[PDB]
Write a protein that binds this ligand. Structure first.
Ligand SMILES: OC[C@H]1O[C@@H](OC[C@H]2O[C@@H](O)[C@H](O)[C@@H](O)[C@@H]2O)[C@H](O)[C@@H](O)[C@@H]1O
Ligand SMILES: OC[C@H]1O[C@@H](O)[C@H](O)[C@@H](O)[C@@H]1O
Ligand SMILES: OC[C@H]1O[C@H](O)[C@H](O)[C@@H](O)[C@@H]1O
Ligand SMILES: [Ca+2]
Ligand SMILES: [Ca+2]
Lengths: 750, 750
């Protein structure tokens, strides 16, 4: 012999030979992507599924056996959520979440993480990850903020671009490449009330302005698949959204990759959004819109078959989607090698020492020091034994004996440190105990391993967070006088209190947005009492997203943001506190002071009558881009080199940095552009470029910076992204805070 | 002639005659509406103003003198903010705010309020009020919620229809009629962060769906003017928004009334929104867009002149605006009678007893009893001497009782009247407000009504705030004050009943004063906690501009009454209610959030959310649209649609049975909601469409007939058409918008 099995025959002729042999049920089934946890046998044999997701190691082997017993033996696409490492493979390298990764501001490193993930994913026989996420974190109430790269369209685009690159490798023939997905297209991250898949009140212009740019970038860079979002947008779910699917993705951008829906998009139009009377008309609606793969709506099988039989859609429309799906399977070479899992390759590459070292680097660079009164680096900073890199620190001069008290509900919590979409977070049913405990260094673990011989590390759970009850629902723990008293005693007998607080899985993710953003349970009372002991308190926030921190945390000696820092995360936190590394992370997202303060992202649109709420400043608790080091850096003398520009030029600038302190630093210079007068109201400023700079103590450097004129765009009325001629301002400094930015005018001419 | 001064000439010829005699500066000035507080002389003489606003009684007289000294003697239009009564005339009848009035659910009463306002306004020689407000209260953080009729489009349009009817009388030749204004067209109430005139992220379909219906209703019924909103909508300020102005207002609706901008709209495009480079260009943009009157942008004078001089716009464009302005003045008769103020009329009609009786009806019927554990009516309820104004009589079994009236708003007569009244700050000729004797505070109410044997004591129990310069003008919350609390606690310990009057005040309300937390500010929470702990029963009376988050102690107090700035008679109504001299009738026109992060909390939420609650908080409102208690129980029984199959010209007809099962009469407000079961686009779960007031004596049953025209069961589809889609519906009927309180019956539209 048959031509569809002949590798010497062109792919389009192979497609048409196979298609002509297929029954209509076999074609509809090729559009299904089914939940393997419900049983692989019926899915592959009775429904005739093209794809499976959530496939346990046992079911991956069973799926291949069942394909051999089907009439046409069309090989399966096996897809999995491999969200920050290979989430659901016991013993895989689990990296920080996307939000933590974004604090490194380092695309080259994020590419290494995606590549290391793909290497592990490929060995287990998975072909396709639903990753990266390109949603833009605009409402902190939203439960999936941890899955984003933050609040800035440019930074999201840089890092999402790096993940697609690293996942896909050299392309559809790379044995260590896998398909990447551009996820939640588009606008899923800003819906009414910060709720999960409520109405998105987003116009075409607002979508183009703040949400589309990362998607357009990865579409043009060859992202294999796009995933269509849950939410209705101006009344229309993305699944049947003609403007978004035809005018934008397939029209303006000319995207030729494969579409997949999100879990049960087609059925939700019946039972949750109430825009379709039944599943036959939902299926027909989905086919008209030009969908390819339909995820976890099993009744699309009988619904699309009946829709064809009744004349609601043509069989030709089924054919066109099947032609696209088969083309992908043929170009991957699956009919020649369907990329089975290889146990010899699993043992060679999964959780290898190279991958662990990439993981430690991301953890070290993702930590963001938000406040410091001088307590840190603790005892002036520690050294390791001169002979051995790594290993336990030496007791420094001026501090022979110290006691560090590690307290708080997240101080020794394996699962919470890894976050959602990993281990036992709940979406896979084959990892009851999560990943092996010994692969994670918790905060307590890290200090026990690093503290000098003559020091001591004590522990006390100081609070609980929550318990579950029936209306299912979270019950916040009460403050617990005994639990608190035990931590206060540990602190009273110590030189330093490290309080590790935050959230946990029942307060995070799908269907679990939060309204208050506050620490839940007895954590506030624990922080209050620890600060009142007079022992210096370091607040380490291990949480999925930015939280409102109580006053006692702003009165503590220091505050570290860690964002679910992965398996190495607790080694990095202890290294940071003891001064064995310098801090490098910088916020990719803003922290609010109260949920009602929002919006608190840096790129606010101009126009407000006033600058504050009557009962609250509009200034965020911590702003996008900020973060401390253990030294001081002066920014001086910003100059644009030739302030007049035409539309094809590059704005070029120079700025001078001086390290005026005593420790080295890797500084992240941020470059914002402001369009002084605009034809439609626009953001006061936008991030456009950035640069990392290494400074030895005392070193001084003049740094070149550039921004193409073509990047100084807005979305006008009419929805065109255009550079308008006129006056601009270049704002350069260590954060998005206006009192930290040097500024310089430039102009762009018609 | 001179035929312009000739009343036999038909108006179009008079306009043409006068237009041909006017120089260009005179024609531009006729578009100006200027701030008389800045200087009436230069406004009429140098700038040839066509209208004045914020005119004091002295300046009203001076303006008529100055007109007579001009070349062509063109009569001025004098306009004022007459928002709930004649706001800034010392001392007119000041009614409850619109938000308070809306709790009466009574358009006939609201029309009486507007007619009475208009009689007083006309005697003072104002021709035009900037009222009613048609914004929809969809974010509780907004500072101007008190100016709206709540959160529902239908009720808003009922009550604003009534205000326009009452203001305008029999038309332009009515001596007691004045011009109404449909205010803030459109979308000003829902902008980012709840802030004042931040960006409105509102698509065409969202605006058509929830904001436009009341504006379309009053434009169709003859509202004489429309005011264009401050805010930029999808990047375009309303002032230059061609879709809104030309396609919708002047296009689909064919509205021929007069337009005015809001305060400094034209100039804000330069200095606040940054969408115009200078005032010449701002003035040209405003002319091209079709504006009529330009409010408080004095530089529109030189700017529009330089714009014509440079050919940016044609003089005929100015001409067309003047024609519409002059046509109004002629039809008003202003050239034969400029409608001067008349002191004898002022003394005959302002604050007459008939207007005080209307005001007392509104205040009585607007209080909303939110909670009651049985403590109210107090001591089982009191009577008057069989003497409808005098003191109440001590009841059987309670010859001496002491009521402790406490709280910062218990005797604060400025906060009771609210924003847009007296000394709120927008007029500058009444620095002491209205005459103190015209206002009954809550304290005044109990002192005047308690029986002879009873006593009434008083303790301010908390302060709210003080002011301070910004810590780079600013509100500083009062700290809890132990001596002040102890004094109130001692009064409550010596009383039978403690009435705690709490809420907000002017520095936390209105323009530029949005709020983030919605909580009670200052020492009020500490006060309530302490009063509830005495063991004396506590009634919380909320005097506030908008719904607030109440502390847990308020939810544990015996009863809670919502008063929303109840006007000059409001303290009499509160006391009558607590003592049982009236029955409660009010019903909430807006929902109360439990936390600012819980929003949206309006009842008519669009379907689609994955989940029903935040992980840390229910989405159930603290109190919901339409609810409110009485002093008896009413049972809703047997809801029947009369024939279920309908066509687009039909009326849906239903009946429901109500039984008063308690001891006291009640005026019950039956609410009728319609749910469209399957919609072509995502829609609200239900919408209010009718209501009905039913009087029930104790023990009385009634079978009440309800009806909703089939033409009202619309949605806004994709394409932006408001249509009734065939399919299944549900009629939901009951005493509130809560689902567990609604009977349901389905009907079909073919
Ligand atoms: O009140 C006039 C008109 O415009 C807006 O209110 C204007 C308000 O603006 C301040 O800048 C000024 O100091 C106050 O005196 C002034 O009244 C408002 O949005 C409209 O409701 C109102 O009709
Ligand atoms: O993708 C993983 C998850 O997606 C959700 O929508 C489903 O309800 C979960 O049960 C599923 O495991
Ligand atoms: O389970 C696969 C997919 O289901 C749905 C989620 O929104 C998405 O994030 C996930 O990748
Ligand atoms: Ca510009
Ligand atoms: Ca319908």
């Amino acid at each position: 012999t048959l031509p569809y099995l002949d590798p010497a025959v062109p792919v389009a002729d192979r497609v048409e030979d196979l298609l002509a042999r297929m029954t209509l049920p076999e074609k509809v089934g090729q559009m299904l992507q089914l939940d393997a946890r419900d049983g692989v046998g019926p899915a592959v044999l009775e429904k005739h599924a093209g794809s499976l997701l959530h496939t346990s190691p046992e079911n991956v082997l069973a799926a291949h056996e069942l394909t051999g017993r089907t009439r046409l033996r069309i090989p399966l696409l096996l897809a999995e959520d491999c969200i920050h490492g290979h989430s659901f493979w016991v013993g895989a390298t689990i990296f920080p979440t996307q939000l933590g990764m974004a604090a490194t501001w380092d695309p080259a490193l994020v590419e290494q993480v995606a590549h290391a993930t793909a290497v592990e994913v490929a060995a287990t026989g998975v072909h396709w990850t639903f990753s990266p996420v390109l949603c833009i974190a605009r409402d902190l109430r939203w439960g999936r903020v941890d899955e984003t790269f933050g609040e800035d369209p440019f930074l999201i685009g840089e890092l999402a671009s790096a993940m697609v690159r690293g996942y896909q490798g050299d392309g559809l023939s790379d044995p260590t490449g896998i398909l990447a997905t551009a996820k939640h297209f588009a606008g899923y991250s800003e819906t009414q009330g910060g709720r999960d898949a409520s109405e998105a009140d987003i116009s075409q212009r607002k979508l183009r302005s703040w949400f589309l740019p990362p998607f357009e970038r990865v579409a043009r860079e060859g992202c294999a698949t796009f995933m269509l979002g849950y939410q209705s947008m101006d009344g229309v779910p993305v699944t049947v959204n003609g403007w978004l699917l035809d005018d934008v993705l397939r029209g303006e951008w000319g995207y030729t990759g494969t579409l997949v829906t999100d879990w049960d998009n087609v059925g939700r139009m019946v039972w949750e959004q109430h825009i379709q009377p039944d599943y036959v008309h939902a299926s027909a609606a989905a086919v008209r819109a030009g969908n390819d793969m339909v995820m976890t709506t099993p009744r699309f099988f009988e619904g699309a078959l009946e829709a064809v039989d009744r004349g609601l859609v043509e069989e030709a429309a089924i054919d066109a989607a099947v032609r696209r799906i088969l083309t992908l399977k043929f170009r991957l070479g699956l009919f020649e090698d369907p990329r089975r899992p290889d146990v010899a390759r699993q043992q060679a590459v999964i959780a290898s020492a190279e991958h662990a070292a990439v993981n430690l680097e991301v953890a070290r660079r993702s930590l963001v020091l938000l406040t410091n009164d001088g307590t840190l680096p603790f005892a002036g900073g520690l050294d390791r034994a001169a002979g051995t890199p790594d290993g336990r620190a030496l007791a420094p001069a001026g501090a022979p004996a110290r006691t560090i008290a590690v307290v708080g509900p997240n101080a020794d919590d394996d699962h919470t440190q890894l976050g959602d979409w990993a281990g036992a977070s709940g979406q896979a049913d084959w990892l009851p105990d999560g990943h092996p405990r010994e692969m994670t260094t918790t905060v307590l673990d890290g200090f026990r391993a690093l503290a000098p011989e003559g020091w001591a590390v004590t522990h006390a759970r100081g609070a609980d967070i929550l318990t579950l009850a029936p209306d299912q629902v979270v019950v916040p723990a009460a403050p617990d006088d005994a639990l608190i008293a035990e931590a206060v005693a540990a602190a009273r007998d110590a030189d330093l209190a490290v309080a590790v607080v935050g959230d946990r899985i029942e307060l995070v993710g799908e269907g679990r947005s939060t309204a208050t953003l506050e620490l839940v349970g007895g954590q506030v009372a624990l922080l209050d009492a620890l600060v009142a002991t007079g022992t210096p308190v370091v607040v380490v926030v291990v949480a999925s997203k930015p939280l409102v921190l109580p006053p006692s945390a702003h009165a503590a000696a220091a505050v570290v943001w860690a964002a679910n820092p992965g398996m190495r995360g607790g080694q990095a936190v202890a290294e940071l506190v003891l001064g064995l590394i310098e801090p490098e992370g910088r916020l990719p997202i803003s922290f609010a002071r109260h949920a009602g303060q929002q919006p608190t992202y840096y790129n606010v649109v101009r126009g407000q009558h006033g600058v504050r709420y009557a009962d609250l400043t509009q200034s965020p608790a911590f702003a996008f881009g900020e973060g401390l080091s253990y030294t001081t850096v002066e920014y001086a003398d910003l100059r644009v080199l030739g302030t007049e520009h035409g539309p094809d030029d590059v704005v070029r600038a120079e700025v001078t940095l001086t390290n005026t302190g005593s420790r080295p630093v890797r500084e992240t210079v941020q470059v914002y552009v402001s369009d002084t007068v605009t034809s439609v109201t626009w953001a006061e400023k936008e991030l456009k470029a950035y640069r990392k700079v290494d400074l030895a103590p005392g070193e001084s450097a003049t740094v070149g910076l550039e921004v193409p004129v073509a990047d100084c765009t807005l979305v006008d009325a009419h929805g065109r992204r255009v550079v308008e001629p006129g006056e601009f301002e270049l704002r350069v400094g260590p954060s998005s805070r206006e009192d930290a930015l040097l500024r310089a005018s430039f102009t762009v001419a018609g």
